[PDB]
Subunit: 324 residues, 3 copies
């Protein structure tokens, strides 16, 4: 079975087995690249990559995945896009859909990409919107499976620390619900995900055997976790509020799990080697913000495997929807 | 096969640089490449060729059409955007042309004066293709003529009658007039006299038309202009690199030439089709189109939503044909 | 004999024979492309081109060379958010190194590219930093060889006129010392290269048979030269008055006493009124052309477009040598 010709707009649109299939495909494509046996399933296909806001990481993952599979790409960056100011999205979708075989869109509201998905007539893939970051969560779930000693996703427990009211938190929560996982959102109540979405995901989790806990208590939130995940907190008010949710070595110890792994979608502020991270940390007497250098660079840290897996999972999305 | 040989290594700077039969050859070639692509039998004639795409203005259709065409034909591309170049600021176009010509096998240029692209064409040493200037947009019109043929069962171009409404002296108007003269068509340019093409260009086209059996009418009278037309064509009333303050004094002047359902009815032709080079301002789903239309109490500018989305509209077929026709130009001039 | 897996960060990192090898490979690749016999050694490789500062010239040479060799490229152009603002270079290098097979960097301090080179895990190539422009000098040396009536580099004498205190002057001086050449830096004393780099190059030149001369005297500086080289001079008002005596004009060519002397320039050049900037500057001083006159630039002595073409072939050599298989 396949997702041939589907769009990839948000994980809400997919079943448990369909998400698993994409992850399994990602693993097979990864192995094949490393083994030099990769079969080009997108040979002769042309893809357009529309970025209304810069996202070099997502961009590079799409380009490399396309190139590996025999496709060619057109990158349209923030200044290149005429959409919404000079040309409607409906018109733009119909035009691009005539010339290209598939289209990636990274932008603002989910409603924009849904309209592209409705009008383009070829597969449309969401590289990130305000609401959702579905490609990231695929990469994360693949990374979890690679680092969990054969535990399936439904047997995994993880915590996301800090500000969960944003695309990454939203997508982790949906993904966890879908896959029957036990997720804890650990952070200040004001920054828990949207109540409507939580309610929807709780409904999903009840059918899949998943669990969703929202808590301000770090000890309770991380106890027993296989993975700990965080992201940047964006600052005076936010830092003071978020500071207790910093992932440091003590937090790892509080899991009680010597095999705990640490994940971060990146970029991370973990030391004074960025302009911004130094500015903030100095103003606040910190060394690293959402995560400490010690944790970020430890053997528990799997962030660069997670980063690499952006590419393999985006490759799976394109192959599944557009490959032949 | 003189024709094919005679196209090799040419620049594609304006349709004034091509014969009737050459234009027909490129259109036919476009149709052949369109069929082959759909059939999955396309033979790559630009394998190993590298093409530079210089864009001094914004583009969606023309950029993507060059990229896709190049990719389909085995070529690779380097896109240099409006922030990327600055030509003439730090480096002369003569120098830039000579440098790019040593590295690349073909160059596309979209920008300002026709003189600039002609200088590029003179100095590069490889084929240079005009993807739009202030004065001309020749690839557009190849796509438009292919679309007209495809939507005129039986008819050749010399049998077709069409009207262009609006700003007749913009690049698209100019090119449509040239193209119609070259192909023996009956073209009406319908819009205010202040925006008619340059009298020297008109004279040149009228001379061409007399030998092909074409007809060129410039008129401010909508009914005389559209009566009997097979196709009605328009474009946005202010062009790129005109300043946005031009809208203020152009909308009211151009408003009588809006393509609405009533204009279609005035052709007297129930099978009239509508064309537009795109982008179009036909509703409130763009910030600029809403703001301008609202300033005049309009809904849609040069074309109404009703027309644009009707069964008479063939704009997305026209847009797709941008790629097949660009492909033809590159294959003819650089292919082997 | 190979450079497989090496970075190409600066000519200081290479031996005389390694530089010669790269130049010979550039020549071979050039001949192969013209002959239609090129063999693709980067087939299937993906390369990232990071340009923190624009250069359409260097960019196009990397792209075309990658394309000819079967590679695919991702061009990442200049923005408000530079490497090190939001993400460390160490993190960026590691991520890009997992996705790509090779990485070009053009940007700011040499330290940045050295860090990228240390962390990426794949070959890293310097397309220009504040300190060094190594790919340019390889192109220049190939061009010199091609236009030298049978002479090797060690046999060549050349002068660089004007402002030498910058990446091009620095690289030309290193390159010349490495290859045993006789280089004259001809210009006002305040614009000679960094004194520490001069000292280091004088030490290299002593091992290779090279010669480095710094002088303000044009006649003495250009006497006997096979090539004359310059670059743009733009504190715009004060520089131009200082630099004006070092304009390459026909009289300077004649002062070499060499009727076969050739003129080189890394480009872009201000040689007339057909650029906004060149016209704006020249007009203040009643000049037509700044560092070079139109007459010299467009003359039969000028080899600037051969030099420009050679940016591609030499960049191709660097990628093939380090990443090819
Ligand atoms: N991206 C665009 N606005 N394209 C329209 C191109 C044709 C139009 N007459 C122009 O020169 O502006
Ligand atoms: Cl990103
Ligand atoms: Cl999602
Ligand atoms: Cl034309
Ligand atoms: Cl160097």
């Amino acid at each position: 079975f396949n997702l041939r010709n589907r769009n990839f707009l948000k994980l809400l649109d997919f079943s448990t087995k369909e998400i698993q299939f994409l992850i399994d495909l990602s693993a097979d494509l990864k192995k094949a690249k490393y083994a030099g046996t990769e079969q080009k399933k997108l040979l002769g296909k042309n893809i357009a990559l529309i970025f209304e806001k810069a996202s070099t990481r997502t961009r590079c993952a799409f380009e490399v995945a396309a190139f590996d599979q025999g496709a060619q790409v057109t990158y349209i960056g923030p200044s290149g896009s005429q959409i919404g100011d000079k040309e409607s999205m409906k018109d733009t979708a119909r035009v691009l859909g005539r010339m290209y075989d598939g289209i990636q869109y990274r932008g603002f509201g989910q409603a924009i990409v849904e309209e592209l998905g409705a009008f383009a007539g070829v597969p449309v893939w969401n590289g990130l919107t305000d609401e959702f970051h579905p490609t990231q969560i695929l990469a994360d779930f693949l990374t979890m499976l690679e680092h969990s000693q054969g535990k399936a996703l439904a047997d995994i427990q993880f915590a996301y620390l800090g500000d969960a009211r944003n695309n990454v938190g939203n997508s982790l929560m949906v993904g966890a619900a879908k896959m029957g996982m036990d997720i804890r959102l650990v952070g200040p109540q004001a920054y828990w995900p949207d109540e409507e979405l939580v309610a929807a995901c709780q409904a999903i989790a009840k059918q899949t055997g998943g669990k969703i806990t929202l808590t301000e208590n770090v000890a309770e939130g991380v106890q027993g976790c296989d993975f700990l995940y965080t992201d940047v907190w964006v600052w005076d008010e936010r830092v003071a509020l978020m500071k207790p949710y910093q992932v440091n070595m003590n937090v790892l110890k509080q899991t009680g799990n010597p095999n705990v792994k640490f994940m971060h979608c990146l970029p991370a502020f973990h030391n004074d080697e960025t302009t911004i991270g130094k500015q903030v940390a100095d103003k606040f007497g910190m060394k690293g913000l959402e995560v400490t250098e010690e944790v970020f660079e430890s053997e528990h840290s799997i962030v660069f495997d997670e980063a690499e897996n952006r590419m393999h999972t985006i490759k799976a999305v394109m192959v599944a929807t557009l490959g032949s």
